[PDB]
From a paper:
Sequence alignment revealed that Vps75 is a member of the evolutionarily conserved nucleosome assembly protein 1/SE translocation (NAP1/SET) superfamily, members of which function as escorts for histone (H3–H4)2 tetramers and H2A–H2B dimers. Two histone chaperones, Vacuolar Protein Sorting 75 (Vps75) and the Anti-Silencing Function 1 protein (Asf1), are involved in the Rtt109-dependent histone H3K9, H3K27, and H3K56 acetylation. In this study, we solved both dimeric and tetrameric structures of Vps75 from a pathogenic fungus, P. carinii (PcVps75), and identified a structural basis for the inability of PcVps75 to interact with PcRtt109. Therefore, we propose that Vps75 regulates the HAT activity of Rtt109 by affecting the interactions between histones and specific histone chaperones rather than by forming a complex with Rtt109.
The PcVps75 tetramer consists of two identical PcVps75 dimers, dimer I: A/B (orange and yellow) and dimer II: C/D (green and dark green). Four quasi-equivalent protomers of PcVps75 are arranged in a solid, walnut-like structure. Two parallel α-helices (αA1/αB1, αC1/αD1) are present on each side of the PcVps75 tetrameric core, which is composed of four domain IIs. Within the core interior, each PcVps75 dimer contributes two domain IIs, including α-helices (α2–α8) and β–sheets (β1–β3), to form a golf ball-like structure. In this area, residues Y80, F177, W180, and L197 on loop LP1A of protomer A form a hydrophobic interface that surrounds the highly conserved residue F191 on loop LP2D from the opposite PcVps75 protomer D. The polyanion clusters binding to Ca2+ in the Vps75 tetramer neutralize the negative electric charge on the concave surfaces of the PcVps75 dimer, making it more convenient to cover two dimeric PcVps75s together in a tetrameric form. In the PcVps75 tetramer, residues E192, D193, E194, and E196 were involved in a calcium-binding cluster that had essential roles in sustaining the PcVps75 tetramer by burying histone-binding surfaces within the structure. The PcVps75 tetramer conceals the major histone-binding surface of PcVps75, which may be a way of preventing non-specific interactions. When tetrameric PcVps75 encounters histones, it can dissociate into two PcVps75 dimers, thereby exposing the histone-binding surfaces to the histone cargo.
Author numbering:
A (entry chain B): 20 to 219
B (entry chain A): 19 to 220
Amino acid sequence: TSLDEVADIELEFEKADVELLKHQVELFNPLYEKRAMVLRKIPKFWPIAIEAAPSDELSVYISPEDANVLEHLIDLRVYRPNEDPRDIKIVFEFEANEYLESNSLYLMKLFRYSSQKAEASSSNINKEPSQLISEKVNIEWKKNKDLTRQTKGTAPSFFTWFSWTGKENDIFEDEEELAIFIAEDLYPNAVKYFTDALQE
Amino acid sequence: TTSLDEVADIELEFEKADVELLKHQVELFNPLYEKRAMVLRKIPKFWPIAIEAAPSDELSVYISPEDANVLEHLIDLRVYRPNEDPRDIKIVFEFEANEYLESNSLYLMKLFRYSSQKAEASSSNINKEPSQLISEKVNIEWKKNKDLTRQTKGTAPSFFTWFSWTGKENDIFEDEEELAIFIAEDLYPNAVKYFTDALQEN
Ligand SMILES: [Ca+2]
Ligand SMILES: [Ca+2]
Ligand SMILES: [Ca+2]
Ligand SMILES: [Ca+2]
Ligand SMILES: [Ca+2]
């Protein structure tokens, strides 16, 4: 009987959580926009910030030649553009380079919050979250230069992340955690990581 | 470059916005937390059950068998943000009478204050080894031969030494602040989810 009540109260919490996120989005959207314009003026800001971010959340998924592509990353943006603020849109923008084709210099991936999937899950949302789905983002690599190719001897690539959908039965992955890390840690804290790299 | 100067300016805007956001969070959730607490107090052993169900590596690992005996009598846990700076956190443990705590130590309230200067020596340690909080020792009176926090040789490690932590020592090698933040930002807001999970696994 008290479990009933507890259940109802928890629904308001969930409701309040989404409202808070909505306010966050409205509040920080102009700031991120302002910050974006300055950061674009700072050469190699993003590859530096990525490298300085916690190893076990990011760099561990990044190979030397992955880093070579990422050295040409001139912009990183994260948006919460939809009615559900839990949807996250991540944008990578590269300058022309030896690895990517010009048609693939602007890479956008959308992660949608999936109520059905989130309810279905039993795992701790901070440990192994199971809530997001996405569509494949195609990348065309220049000849000889495809880092995501599935052949023997080829280093595992950061860039396979872009093909992730979250639609399989797979509680054993890191792609959703990476998305959340980029959205909720790397992007907001990017200047702090960059600043740390600079001190030595 | 001039660019790095602008970045510093913007960062300050972010920190202000982040504090403003938190104040909104406090006004929005405080009434919900009060209502929830009322209902939790009539669910027997809610808190020790939610604690046991919390991630092992965040809480359980610091709790000894004897610690768990004390925690079995935890009837209320509250977290507040009562100061002008919403980053200050006040954590309240309320126990029923038991064989460990003198009756004058059944209401244990620990205040963590956000330290501006401490935070900016450790700016990139945001979620891995935060170093931003300071606190006052919380005195606990234990019944005779029941002081789990004794520093006698051979004495098993105890969760309850957490209450004496201050964060004013030169010590970047700690778990006490991370425990504070886990309690304030994970255990307390997600307690029901933790309790529910424990109940589906019986
Ligand atoms: Ca997998
Ligand atoms: Ca995978
Ligand atoms: Ca994982
Ligand atoms: Ca220490
Ligand atoms: Ca630690």
